[PDB]
Amino acid sequence: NQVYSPVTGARLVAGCICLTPDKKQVLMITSSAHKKRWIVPKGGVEKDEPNYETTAQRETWEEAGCIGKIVANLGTVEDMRPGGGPPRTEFHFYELEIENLLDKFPECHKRHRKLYSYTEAKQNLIDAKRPELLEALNRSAIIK
Ligand SMILES: O=P(O)(O)O[C@H]1[C@H](OP(=O)(O)O)[C@@H](OP(=O)(O)O)[C@H](OP(=O)(O)O)[C@@H](OP(=O)(O)O)[C@H]1OP(=O)(O)O
Ligand SMILES: [Mg+2]
To answer: Which residues hold Mg(2+) 1?
Structure first.
């Protein structure tokens, strides 16, 4: 039920850089694969979905119980990895303004969630070994 690139054959994923009204803090969730690594909400595009905004906002709700307004398109980043060969993932990110953070959401028992300063969020994605996600974060309007 997943969607792949007709060029690279890379898996199409969409996610959100969820920033507060003041643009000081960003919403991070713990990885499911590894419980101590901090990432941002994102997930596979599905066949029915008409655009990437739909995937982004769906995954943002499921993984982080975040509701908000998409204010910007941060373009794409790739999971370019060791050796040669095409990327495995093509990520489409959007900046979202956090309107509401719900206590309950589909994966609130599988993950932790917390607002971080730019400084600490940058360290977390390094620690998490996800510089593609840090690229996307740096494209946002976060204060540093
Ligand atoms: O759908 P899968 O084939 O299981 O893909 C998983 C899944 O990615 P998605 O969220 O995009 O589905 C993991 O994310 P979780 O939802 O389990 O958190 C992600 O782990 P991260 O949490 O680090 O993103 C992991 O990537 P990794 O290679 O780091 O294990 C990735 O595997 P793929 O390489 O097959 O995409
Ligand atoms: Mg996911």
So the answer is: 42, 63
Contact call for residues 115 and 30 (beta carbons, < 8 A): no
Contact 5, 51 (CB under 8 A): no
Quick one: DSSP state of residue 52? H
How was this one solved?
X-ray
In terms of Cα–Cα distance, which of 66, 65, 57, 67 is closest to 110? Answer: 65
Domain 11-139: CATH superfamily is Nucleoside Triphosphate Pyrophosphohydrolase (3.90.79.10)
* N residues, the chain: 144
Q: Which of 8, 31, 93, 111 to mutate to test the pocket of ligand 1 (most atoms within 8 A of CB)?
A: 31
Residues in a beta bridge with 91: 13, 77
Which H, E and C letters describe 96-139, residue by residue? Answer: EEEEEECCCCCCCCCCCEEEEEHHHHHHHHHHCCCHHHHHHHHH
Domain extent listing, the chain: 11-139
Residue closest by Cα to atom 30 of ligand 1: 33
**CA of 22 relative to ligand 1 center, distance in Å:** 30
Q: At how many Å resolution was this determined? A: 2.5
